[PDB]
RNA sequence: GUUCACCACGGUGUGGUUGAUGACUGGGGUGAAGUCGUAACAAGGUAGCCGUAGGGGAACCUGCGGCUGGAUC
RNA sequence: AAACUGAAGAGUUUGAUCAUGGCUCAGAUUGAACGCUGGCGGCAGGCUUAACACAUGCAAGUCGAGCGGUAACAGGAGAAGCUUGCUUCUUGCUGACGAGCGGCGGACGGGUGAGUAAUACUUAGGAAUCUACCUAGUAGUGGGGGAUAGCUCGGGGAAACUCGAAUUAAUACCGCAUACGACCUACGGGAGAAAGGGGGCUCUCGCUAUUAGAUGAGCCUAAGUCGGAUUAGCUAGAUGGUGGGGUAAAGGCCUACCAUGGCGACGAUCUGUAGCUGGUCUGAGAGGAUGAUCAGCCACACCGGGACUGAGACACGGCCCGGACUCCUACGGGAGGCAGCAGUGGGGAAUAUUGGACAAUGGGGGCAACCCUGAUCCAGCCAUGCCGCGUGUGUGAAGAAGGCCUUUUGGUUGUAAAGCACUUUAAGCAGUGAAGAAGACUCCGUGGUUAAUACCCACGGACGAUGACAUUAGCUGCAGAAUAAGCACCGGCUAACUCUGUGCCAGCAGCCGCGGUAAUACAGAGGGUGCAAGCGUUAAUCGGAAUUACUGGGCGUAAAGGGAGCGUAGGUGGCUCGAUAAGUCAGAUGUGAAAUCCCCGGGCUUAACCUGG
């Protein structure tokens, strides 16, 4: 970077990306549980994994980590495969 | 290519730097260019008076 | 540019009087050579071609008004585009030039001296509708229906203007122009009609030449 | 909205047909109208129409890679 | 945002603006949305020096555009007479 | 951090296309007071021409079929 | 009312002719080059080649009214050595302000045309999307926590920079609390925000969730859009479907399985070439050629790849990795990308200043003040083009001299010159002098606001703070013809003819051709012709060329009927009564950007130019 602000915007980007990648990774782990519980066809474990994911999944969509439309879509599509899994 | 040196007299030898324009010479087979007189190394025709600009000759004072 | 050289060898090349000399002497007395074209031979053999009676007819109109080819080929382009006959719209644009009109009105002994009056800021034009008398130094101003010409106060006592009037009265004054000698003022009432200029100019040869 | 009519030249795809629409595009210099044709793959949800039928197809949102039209009516059928 | 601004025309030392509705990021003389008049800085006392279609200048204000400080004054000194 | 997946550079092998060059070689053209003939144009002195085959320093010749764009009849 | 106006041929095959048919020419045009010459102004244009490599300067900052603060700076208050008017040290106390955290901008504006023959462009539509700033709404803006940059303390490094310990603020970050909308829902219910600052409890700038606009972006469909068949077969995530993933969003975009599809002589595939358009040149038109400057779209930013942040980038002057090159180094390591504006080297036939200012129109930041802006507005260089003006004007004959020809005496240069009388455009000199400026600030008044006559905002007055250009444009005076003409051609085409020299030599030439001792064709002169601050030459496009013929040609013998037939695709197709309305025609509507072209006007003294409909 050749100018002060360009140098500042660059060191301001590693900070804004480490912080938002520890939250991007958080969104993913909480969905591994919902996909690991579905893979073992367990409604009781999946609903208890889908239930502790909604608050994570959409709190991080209000923050900007993922888009609300991805948060809605992940909720819908996961609720459509547990509801069908011997409701 | 081979170009035609028009005018009465010239000062061209090997390694002379010349400007070449288009225009063929009817009587000469395989000559389709004219060397520009006065351009870079080619000198204007020495004692020209009438068609001076066609032979790179300055207006006589 | 304009043509500076001798004027009575232009006429002689055209074979007619071009008004390039103030009418104090008869045309055949000012030159006395006006039977043979200028130069060594002049009057000789060779049969002139169709292109030669076309070039000489357009060269003649150009020499009369003092206009060079580029300004004169623009006139033919204005006259062709313009509605109506081309060779009559052309003769109107040339007769509506401001430097031509201060000679048809009597303030210039000849168009070359009337060119020397318009150019030297000694002639004011007033566009019809406006009320101010602007000074101009452009010979090629196209006058329109109602424009009023007047001599500049600084040069209203000109010794060369005073005798240009005297000599114009013998030549006459057109009907499409109203002149006032006492007030050194005129009026371009109307562009001249085809039947208000000499019938020796063949404008059909001019339009014929500008089509290759 | 934007309906198009043509024959069915292929129907050997699941919920899909190939429709041949004919047009008379006029030569831009010689003025003769040349009858040209394009193959448009439409979507037949119930997979009912066969090849050789007249079908109306309307433009819709794309359903596949090279399929964005859908069957709306079968005016004519194979004789 | 959308802006109602002037786009320079005319010639050297002889400007002639056309009041224009455009996206604010487009070049001054570039792409616009609608042309709604003109403006002669150097004009005569018997010539239309300012003209502006007031029906779309208002349509475009209830719609979101933001006039520039030169056109807002231009309207301000054109509807007063 | 480690490891796996994807992947850029890079490497390897084998082909295709294409430019410039190449001893030598083929015909094409231009150039003079050349050498050998005289094939065609007249019935051009064996009518010419087409396809094909054989032959011959070279134009060309000969056979077979065809044509008149062949004169004399 | 008007946009409705436009069409030329010649030379050259022959002893001669007519036809055929090529070649050449006269025209227009240029981002032009070169040769000779060169006065001025206005308006445009100016690296077409190396998307070659780039020295140096500038081209993106701004906010202290988010925050801790105090490196400089200027003050202010007190210490006053007081050295009596020298003068310093403490203090963020104030104007402000370097670095730092934070916000907005940097995705625009500007450049280029390498790639790209189709994720492009043009035209017409569509639905499955997101959208900072802006407009109009709706519900809010509650309450806590843990950090951390700068600042310290100690190191490492030649530098670039860096490592550790301690640690403060915030509109930085993270919980918790609520939620009109909004999201998921099995529709029973579940989960999700934010931040404060400023002016005198208010108002305002903000922030949060969201609706509808507008704007912008992404996506899709159909039609159109270069050449080659001496490139005919092309495809295996390939064609379609389902489950799942992925996206802001449809979709083989990805994936597993299932089927075996999809495209192609209406040109797939492979090649070569190219940014596309409005437009530009040409042309009577139809066409042909082209895609500079202006505007729209696209793509690219030393080369290959990946992403981050963000409303928006896979980012021209941002990040990471790799590479080539250039540079610095203490040899361990580092830095950089003018296809921004100037400019350099190089390449080239060839294309400019390392200029001024943010005054105007815009853009970024800010409450403003104000700052930034090589966008832009101007200035500089260049006859590169278009347009305009000038280089004088009248009068002057036993028709002077000099040149040239000549029948030796006439002709011609020629009213041309001289002489005489004028004029001062342009340039020069001196004055004067608009307009580009939008009237910021400050003050008053009115209205809204309010608890309020504060504040804020809107409106109405006063006032003059603001001009780079600039010594402006213009206008008025002074002087003196004073400072200002060249280029090509003159056998025919093609306007314009004679001598002298030369002797198939020297040379000319677009073509036909000229030159071999009397050359209108070479070279020089005189005279003339055409253009003119230009004139010629070369390059290039169209024209003439009806010479690819659609408009608008031919095929017995001039080039040209396939050796003949059968026949596929295709093209075309009898009569009569119906139906349909696709083609066809008409009408309406939407659209066909602006500019350009044309018509009618209007402003530059005219014109070029600008401009309204």
UniProtKB/TrEMBL annotation, chain A:
<dbReference type="InterPro" id="IPR036510">
    <property type="entry name" value="Ribosomal_bS20_sf"/>
</dbReference>
<comment type="similarity">
    <text>Belongs to the bacterial ribosomal protein bS20 family.</text>
</comment>
<keyword id="KW-0699">rRNA-binding</keyword>
<keyword id="KW-0694">RNA-binding</keyword>
<dbReference type="GO" id="GO:0015935">
    <property type="term" value="C:small ribosomal subunit"/>
</dbReference>
<dbReference type="GO" id="GO:0006412">
    <property type="term" value="P:translation"/>
</dbReference>
<feature type="region of interest" description="Disordered">
    <location>
        <begin position="1"/>
        <end position="25"/>
    </location>
</feature>
<dbReference type="GO" id="GO:0003735">
    <property type="term" value="F:structural constituent of ribosome"/>
</dbReference>
<keyword id="KW-0689">Ribosomal protein</keyword>
<comment type="function">
    <text>Binds directly to 16S ribosomal RNA.</text>
</comment>
<dbReference type="InterPro" id="IPR002583">
    <property type="entry name" value="Ribosomal_bS20"/>
</dbReference>
<dbReference type="Pfam" id="PF01649">
    <property type="entry name" value="Ribosomal_S20p"/>
</dbReference>
UniProtKB/TrEMBL annotation, chain B:
<protein>
    <recommendedName>
        <fullName>Small ribosomal subunit protein uS12</fullName>
    </recommendedName>
</protein>
<comment type="function">
    <text>With S4 and S5 plays an important role in translational accuracy.</text>
</comment>
<comment type="function">
    <text>Interacts with and stabilizes bases of the 16S rRNA that are involved in tRNA selection in the A site and with the mRNA backbone. Located at the interface of the 30S and 50S subunits, it traverses the body of the 30S subunit contacting proteins on the other side and probably holding the rRNA structure together. The combined cluster of proteins S8, S12 and S17 appears to hold together the shoulder and platform of the 30S subunit.</text>
</comment>
<comment type="similarity">
    <text>Belongs to the universal ribosomal protein uS12 family.</text>
</comment>
<comment type="subunit">
    <text>Part of the 30S ribosomal subunit. Contacts proteins S8 and S17. May interact with IF1 in the 30S initiation complex.</text>
</comment>
UniProtKB/TrEMBL annotation, chain D:
<dbReference type="InterPro" id="IPR012340">
    <property type="entry name" value="NA-bd_OB-fold"/>
</dbReference>
<dbReference type="InterPro" id="IPR019979">
    <property type="entry name" value="Ribosomal_uS17_CS"/>
</dbReference>
<comment type="function">
    <text>One of the primary rRNA binding proteins, it binds specifically to the 5'-end of 16S ribosomal RNA.</text>
</comment>
<keyword id="KW-0687">Ribonucleoprotein</keyword>
<comment type="similarity">
    <text>Belongs to the universal ribosomal protein uS17 family.</text>
</comment>
<dbReference type="GO" id="GO:0003735">
    <property type="term" value="F:structural constituent of ribosome"/>
</dbReference>
<dbReference type="Pfam" id="PF00366">
    <property type="entry name" value="Ribosomal_S17"/>
</dbReference>
<dbReference type="GO" id="GO:0006412">
    <property type="term" value="P:translation"/>
</dbReference>
<keyword id="KW-0699">rRNA-binding</keyword>
<dbReference type="InterPro" id="IPR000266">
    <property type="entry name" value="Ribosomal_uS17"/>
</dbReference>
<protein>
    <recommendedName>
        <fullName>Small ribosomal subunit protein uS17</fullName>
    </recommendedName>
</protein>
<dbReference type="InterPro" id="IPR019984">
    <property type="entry name" value="Ribosomal_uS17_bact/chlr"/>
</dbReference>
Automatic annotation (TrEMBL), chain E:
<dbReference type="InterPro" id="IPR000307">
    <property type="entry name" value="Ribosomal_bS16"/>
</dbReference>
<dbReference type="GO" id="GO:0003735">
    <property type="term" value="F:structural constituent of ribosome"/>
</dbReference>
<comment type="similarity">
    <text>Belongs to the bacterial ribosomal protein bS16 family.</text>
</comment>
<dbReference type="GO" id="GO:0005737">
    <property type="term" value="C:cytoplasm"/>
</dbReference>
<dbReference type="GO" id="GO:0015935">
    <property type="term" value="C:small ribosomal subunit"/>
</dbReference>
<dbReference type="Pfam" id="PF00886">
    <property type="entry name" value="Ribosomal_S16"/>
</dbReference>
<protein>
    <recommendedName>
        <fullName>Small ribosomal subunit protein bS16</fullName>
    </recommendedName>
</protein>
<keyword id="KW-0687">Ribonucleoprotein</keyword>
<dbReference type="InterPro" id="IPR023803">
    <property type="entry name" value="Ribosomal_bS16_dom_sf"/>
</dbReference>
<keyword id="KW-0689">Ribosomal protein</keyword>
<dbReference type="InterPro" id="IPR020592">
    <property type="entry name" value="Ribosomal_bS16_CS"/>
</dbReference>
<dbReference type="GO" id="GO:0006412">
    <property type="term" value="P:translation"/>
</dbReference>
